[PDB]
């Protein structure tokens, strides 16, 4: 499987591969690929797919429950500023 | 000599107060002084804040009153950090109690410490820990099992009594039969998954290591239960666990899957199995062969949904609201697309690649939507042959507790090591790793596959086991 | 004119819960930044989604008001992209298996006929947060990450840039009657995204599609589409192909732009969201929503023509702005002469309250105090002049009439 498709699934990853990961990835997922291509044998038109049982789509009440405290909540931030999660400008 | 008994042992003790908790936690935090430099088996050790804890501790009717507990680095402690043992989440302190850890403090435990994983439960064996490997006290040249390494091998050497892990694919069981040792995963919502760093959300499921069967039953009893906080944890009431293991159920079924004939295992498995199997037949056990025409195909279905879930369940590191971010970064892309490239491990970074692939328009209806199909599939193999039996048996693993870079060459090799592990998660069955024997100085763990919400069974045949063949002695590390 | 203008819409409406979609947090506007937050909503490691009940009654009313098929079984989806203002790396909405189909909306043209817009589908979803700029840095705030969302989708049923505001005007209506949504674009309670292709006229093909993205009043989305509309004309005629983009609208140009960056979209990665179950609506509960369905506009209209003698004029005005038909109501309740209180409600109070700049909520002017005036009116104890400058008083002071009549002498 080509270079350009582990850059292209890296990116919708959001993953820099450095070059030496870019040939690693090539060889052990065109494996990896190979090693799990053992599902077509099996005929699946007519199976429903997985879902665990359940009798009633769990809900909850509209009643408010109190928030995390603000400090706790940016203490692991990597940048914060005024209450706000500080990043790097978007356009 | 005191972390050398079981729980009911230091119950009695701390009930009527020949001993403190203080004590306790004193007791096993030596034996971690003795064996952690050989094994390795925590990241936070937290001995040190249980000591104080300890102090506070007075109710001594509380179910797990002076208990000491490890607790699986991917299970949040509050104030303490949670790692995931990854360098993404190195220096993150977890803003909140997971809900076993809300319901263990609740019963008197006491978390002392933060045990080795591989980086965000991906691999079996703890070598892809971002920070050390955990060792298999047994042989320090072998692995522990993974992902749940350090949690297993800390209730090995006994530097806990009990501990908690998570399986999604083996990750209790198979750690639990290479360090010879107790491990169950319960059905599928069984426990809550909240404040379970999440890996694969529909196979993930929190369990429990231990050395006797009534410790492993008495800790999962705890942290069982409907959660509100967890919309797929079920309304199910939890059945009376420490009470029901010593019971005994007369005419049980064992089924022995006729596909698993043709799966290559170790002779010494093989053996260590069919004693177990024999010895259970002379207790009175029927013994049928049963057919699964689908659990070959077991691997490949996991190895699509559990990737899938995975590469969107860590979406989420991306150095904006906690964690790791990169240094340098010209823009808002590279500070994400760097983050994370430095933040995740190898097999980490592999199963968000395949996941993403796998999810991808184009190829999802391929991938995972047919292995979600084929898991249906797999699932009613089992319904059906528990027509006819009651619980499934097999070896928890094809070898023997292999050794540090065997099987990192190739990460296929990795990946076999769960052949035996993962059918019970694709059908979200309970199953439990019991150690069966000892085959040239190493643990072999018999595995058995309930049905839904029959953890019970599960648990009786591994107490009536233990009374046969007293595992709990074999302690490693002199 | 040799052409014709396709239009569809996509609306995004909030829903007016007092919980977040998925966690127990406050919706609420203004508040201090990232104080109505969670371990769920914030996106950390090991939070769980739970599905709020009232956001899914809410939306299945929504549903029945804009006359969908309403699907006993949906499913939330994972739509994955990556962005500071989103925790989770993914919004959970609905994508195959979304919550109603096949719906319709009324227009009333100015011309005097009636149109139909179709609803392509109504879906539940959450909201995202917002991004402030300052300097080299985007400040977040996660209080509205979360939010409950309707995602309302038109087929390009709509021909005009008026019967596009005509079109936003009606749902906002609909979903002010319904009582789900405040539904004003000020507060961001709802949004809309545009979607236009030309196409030769009488033609069944369709043309070339761009997308404008963010107009932030009705108004503007007439005024983009009226220019863009004549952009693509442009084009076509001067022998050109229409291409294929998302565009910009600046109120201050009247004028829509392509944008400077090539940014294709990117693969949403669907699937169905493993932490949450189907979500399965009973048909006694859609039977039960159906049957207390609070009083729609298209419904009104034509009551207050019944039951009050209103001429088309008179009720689409009580209609078109709810609390002013609610006034009329209170007021016709006290003294019973329709006819009298529309006309010093429409042609006296209404017009003094706008020079005031307050809103009929909040007027002085009572309706038991326009049914009380009126009275006097009516019985001939004070002329129309001097109504006229009792009326005006009212306003200012918030006396009764018959207050101000004993104070100046009868
Ligand atoms: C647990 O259980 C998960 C085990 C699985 N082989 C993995 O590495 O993801
Ligand atoms: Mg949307
Ligand atoms: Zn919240």
């Given at each position: 499987?080509?270079?350009?498709?582990?850059?292209?699934?890296?990116?919708?990853?959001?993953?820099?591969?450095?070059?030496?990961?870019?040939?690693?990835?090539?060889?052990?997922?065109?494996?990896?690929?190979?090693?799990?291509?053992?599902?077509?044998?099996?005929?699946?038109?007519?199976?429903?797919?997985?879902?665990?049982?359940?009798?009633?789509?769990?809900?909850?009440?509209?009643?408010?429950?109190?928030?995390?405290?603000?400090?706790?909540?940016?203490?692991?931030?990597?940048?914060?500023?005024?209450?706000?999660?500080?990043?790097?400008?978007?356009? | 000599?005191?972390?050398?008994?079981?729980?009911?042992?230091?119950?009695?003790?701390?009930?009527?107060?020949?001993?403190?908790?203080?004590?306790?936690?004193?007791?096993?935090?030596?034996?971690?002084?003795?064996?952690?430099?050989?094994?390795?088996?925590?990241?936070?050790?937290?001995?040190?804040?249980?000591?104080?804890?300890?102090?506070?501790?007075?109710?001594?009717?509380?179910?797990?009153?002076?208990?000491?507990?490890?607790?699986?680095?991917?299970?949040?402690?509050?104030?303490?950090?949670?790692?995931?043992?990854?360098?993404?989440?190195?220096?993150?302190?977890?803003?909140?109690?997971?809900?076993?850890?809300?319901?263990?403090?609740?019963?008197?435990?006491?978390?002392?410490?933060?045990?080795?994983?591989?980086?965000?439960?991906?691999?079996?064996?703890?070598?892809?820990?971002?920070?050390?490997?955990?060792?298999?006290?047994?042989?320090?040249?072998?692995?522990?099992?993974?992902?749940?390494?350090?949690?297993?091998?800390?209730?090995?050497?006994?530097?806990?009594?009990?501990?908690?892990?998570?399986?999604?694919?083996?990750?209790?069981?198979?750690?639990?039969?290479?360090?010879?040792?107790?491990?169950?995963?319960?059905?599928?919502?069984?426990?809550?998954?909240?404040?379970?760093?999440?890996?694969?959300?529909?196979?993930?499921?929190?369990?429990?290591?231990?050395?006797?069967?009534?410790?492993?039953?008495?800790?999962?009893?705890?942290?069982?239960?409907?959660?509100?906080?967890?919309?797929?944890?079920?309304?199910?009431?939890?059945?009376?666990?420490?009470?029901?293991?010593?019971?005994?159920?007369?005419?049980?079924?064992?089924?022995?899957?006729?596909?698993?004939?043709?799966?290559?295992?170790?002779?010494?498995?093989?053996?260590?199995?069919?004693?177990?199997?024999?010895?259970?037949?002379?207790?009175?056990?029927?013994?049928?062969?049963?057919?699964?025409?689908?659990?070959?195909?077991?691997?490949?279905?996991?190895?699509?949904?559990?990737?899938?879930?995975?590469?969107?369940?860590?979406?989420?590191?991306?150095?904006?609201?906690?964690?790791?971010?990169?240094?340098?970064?010209?823009?808002?892309?590279?500070?994400?697309?760097?983050?994370?490239?430095?933040?995740?491990?190898?097999?980490?970074?592999?199963?968000?690649?395949?996941?993403?692939?796998?999810?991808?328009?184009?190829?999802?209806?391929?991938?995972?939507?047919?292995?979600?199909?084929?898991?249906?599939?797999?699932?009613?193999?089992?319904?059906?042959?528990?027509?006819?039996?009651?619980?499934?048996?097999?070896?928890?693993?094809?070898?023997?507790?292999?050794?540090?870079?065997?099987?990192?060459?190739?990460?296929?090799?990795?990946?076999?090591?769960?052949?035996?592990?993962?059918?019970?998660?694709?059908?979200?069955?309970?199953?439990?790793?019991?150690?069966?024997?000892?085959?040239?100085?190493?643990?072999?763990?018999?595995?058995?596959?309930?049905?839904?919400?029959?953890?019970?069974?599960?648990?009786?045949?591994?107490?009536?086991?233990?009374?046969?063949?007293?595992?709990?002695?074999?302690?490693?590390?002199? | 004119?040799?052409?014709?203008?396709?239009?569809?819409?996509?609306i995004?409406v909030?829903?007016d819960?007092?919980?977040?979609?998925?966690?127990?947090?406050?919706?609420?506007?203004?508040?201090?930044?990232?104080?109505?937050?969670?371990?769920?909503?914030?996106?950390?490691?090991?939070?769980?989604?739970?599905?709020?009940?009232?956001?899914?009654?809410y939306?299945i009313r929504a549903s029945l008001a804009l006359n969908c098929?309403?699907?006993?079984?949906?499913?939330?989806?994972?739509?994955?992209?990556?962005?500071?203002?989103?925790?989770?790396?993914?919004?959970?909405?609905?994508?195959?298996?979304?919550?109603?189909?096949?719906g319709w909306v009324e227009l009333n043209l100015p011309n005097g006929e009636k149109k139909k817009v179709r609803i392509?589908?109504?879906?539940?979803?959450?909201?995202?947060?917002?991004?402030?700029?300052?300097?080299?840095?985007?400040?977040?705030?996660?209080?509205?990450?979360?939010?409950?969302?309707?995602?309302i989708?038109?087929?390009?049923?709509?021909?005009?840039?008026e019967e596009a505001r005509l079109f936003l005007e009606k749902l906002r209506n609909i979903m002010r009657y319904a009582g789900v949504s405040k539904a004003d674009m000020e507060?961001?309670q709802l949004?809309?995204?545009?979607?236009?292709?030309?196409?030769?006229?009488?033609?069944?093909?369709?043309?070339?599609?761009?997308?404008?993205?963010?107009?932030?009043?009705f108004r503007?989305?007439?005024?983009?589409?009226?220019?863009?509309?004549?952009?693509?004309?442009?084009?076509?005629?001067?022998?050109?192909?229409?291409?294929?983009?998302?565009?910009?609208?600046?109120?201050?140009?009247?004028?829509?732009?392509?944008?400077?960056?090539?940014?294709?979209?990117?693969?949403?990665?669907?699937?169905?969201?493993?932490?949450?179950?189907?979500?399965?609506?009973?048909?006694?509960?859609?039977?039960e929503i159906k049957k207390n369905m609070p009083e729609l506009p298209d419904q009104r209209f034509e009551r207050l023509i019944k039951e009050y003698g209103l001429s088309e004029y008179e009720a689409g005005i009580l209609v078109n702005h709810k609390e002013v038909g609610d006034f009329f109501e209170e007021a016709v309740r006290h003294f019973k002469e329709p006819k009298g209180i529309v006309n010093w409600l429409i042609n006296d109070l209404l017009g003094l309250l706008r020079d005031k700049g307050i809103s009929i909520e909040e007027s002085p002017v009572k309706p038991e105090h326009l049914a009380e005036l009126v009275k006097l009116i009516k019985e001939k104890?004070?002329?129309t002049?001097?109504g006229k400058?009792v009326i005006k008083?009212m306003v200012?002071?918030?006396?009764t009439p018959?207050?101000?009549?004993?104070?100046?002498?009868?």
């Open positions: 499987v080509d270079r350009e498709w582990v850059l292209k699934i890296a990116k919708l990853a959001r993953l820099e591969l450095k070059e030496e990961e870019i040939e690693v990835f090539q060889k052990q997922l065109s494996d990896i690929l190979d090693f799990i291509d053992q599902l077509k044998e099996l005929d699946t038109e007519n199976v429903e797919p997985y879902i665990q049982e359940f009798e009633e789509t769990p809900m909850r009440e509209d009643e408010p429950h109190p928030s995390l405290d603000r400090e706790k909540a940016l203490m692991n931030a990597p940048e914060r500023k005024d209450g706000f999660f500080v990043v790097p400008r978007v356009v | 000599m005191l972390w050398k008994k079981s729980l009911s042992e230091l119950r009695e003790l701390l009930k009527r107060g020949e001993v403190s908790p203080k004590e306790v936690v004193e007791s096993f935090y030596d034996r971690y002084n003795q064996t952690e430099e050989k094994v390795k088996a925590y990241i936070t050790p937290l001995y040190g804040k249980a000591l104080k804890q300890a102090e506070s501790l007075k109710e001594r009717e509380l179910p797990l009153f002076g208990i000491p507990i490890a607790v699986k680095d991917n299970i949040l402690v509050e104030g303490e950090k949670t790692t995931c043992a990854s360098k993404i989440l190195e220096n993150f302190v977890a803003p909140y109690d997971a809900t076993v850890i809300e319901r263990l403090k609740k019963a008197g435990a006491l978390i002392v410490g933060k045990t080795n994983l591989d980086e965000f439960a991906m691999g079996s064996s703890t070598e892809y820990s971002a920070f050390f490997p955990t060792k298999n006290p047994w042989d320090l040249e072998r692995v522990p099992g993974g992902s749940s390494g350090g949690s297993a091998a800390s209730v090995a050497v006994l530097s806990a009594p009990v501990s908690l892990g998570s399986d999604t694919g083996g990750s209790i069981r198979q750690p639990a039969s290479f360090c010879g040792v107790i491990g169950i995963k319960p059905t599928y919502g069984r426990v809550s998954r909240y404040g379970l760093v999440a890996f694969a959300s529909s196979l993930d499921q929190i369990g429990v290591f231990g050395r006797r069967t009534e410790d492993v039953a008495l800790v999962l009893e705890v942290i069982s239960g409907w959660d509100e906080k967890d919309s797929t944890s079920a309304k199910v009431p939890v059945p009376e666990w420490s009470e029901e293991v010593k019971k005994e159920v007369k005419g049980l079924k064992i089924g022995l899957p006729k596909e698993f004939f043709e799966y290559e295992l170790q002779p010494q498995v093989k053996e260590a199995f069919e004693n177990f199997i024999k010895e259970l037949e002379k207790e009175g056990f029927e013994i049928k062969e049963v057919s699964l025409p689908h659990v070959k195909y077991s691997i490949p279905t996991y190895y699509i949904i559990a990737p899938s879930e995975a590469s969107s369940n860590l979406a989420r590191y991306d150095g904006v609201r906690y964690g790791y971010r990169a240094k340098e970064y010209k823009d808002i892309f590279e500070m994400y697309a760097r983050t994370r490239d430095e933040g995740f491990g190898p097999e980490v970074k592999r199963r968000i690649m395949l996941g993403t692939f796998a999810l991808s328009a184009g190829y999802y209806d391929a991938y995972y939507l047919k292995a979600q199909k084929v898991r249906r599939l797999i699932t009613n193999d089992f319904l059906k042959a528990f027509e006819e039996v009651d619980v499934i048996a097999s070896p928890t693993t094809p070898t023997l507790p292999f050794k540090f870079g065997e099987r990192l060459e190739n990460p296929i090799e990795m990946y076999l090591s769960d052949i035996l592990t993962v059918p019970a998660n694709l059908a979200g069955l309970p199953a439990i790793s019991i150690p069966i024997a000892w085959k040239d100085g190493l643990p072999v763990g018999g595995q058995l596959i309930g049905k839904h919400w029959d953890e019970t069974t599960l648990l009786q045949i591994s107490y009536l086991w233990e009374q046969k063949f007293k595992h709990y002695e074999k302690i490693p590390l002199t | 004119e040799k052409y014709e203008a396709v239009i569809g819409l996509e995004h909030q829903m819960t007092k919980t977040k979609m998925f966690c127990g947090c406050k919706v609420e506007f203004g508040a201090e930044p990232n104080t109505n937050v969670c371990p769920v909503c914030l996106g950390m490691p090991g939070a769980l989604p739970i599905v709020n009940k009232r956001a899914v009654e939306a098929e309403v699907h006993e079984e949906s499913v939330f989806a994972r739509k994955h992209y990556f962005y500071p203002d989103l925790p989770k790396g993914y919004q959970i909405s609905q994508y195959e298996k979304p919550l109603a189909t096949n392509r589908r109504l879906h539940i979803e959450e909201d995202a947060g917002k991004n402030i700029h300052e300097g080299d840095k985007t400040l977040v705030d996660l209080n509205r990450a979360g939010t409950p969302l309707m995602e989708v038109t087929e390009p049923d709509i021909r005009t840039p507060k961001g949004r809309c995204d545009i979607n236009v292709s030309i196409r030769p006229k009488g033609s069944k093909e369709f043309g070339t599609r761009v997308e404008i993205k963010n107009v932030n009043s503007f989305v007439q005024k983009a589409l009226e220019y863009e509309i004549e952009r693509q004309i442009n084009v076509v005629e001067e022998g050109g192909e229409v291409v294929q983009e998302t565009r910009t609208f600046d109120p201050q140009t009247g004028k829509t732009y392509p944008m400077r960056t090539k940014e294709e979209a990117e693969d949403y990665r669907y699937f169905p969201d493993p932490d949450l179950v189907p979500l399965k609506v009973k048909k006694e509960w859609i039977e104890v004070i002329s002049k001097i400058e008083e200012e002071t918030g006396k018959s207050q101000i009549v004993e104070e100046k002498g009868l």
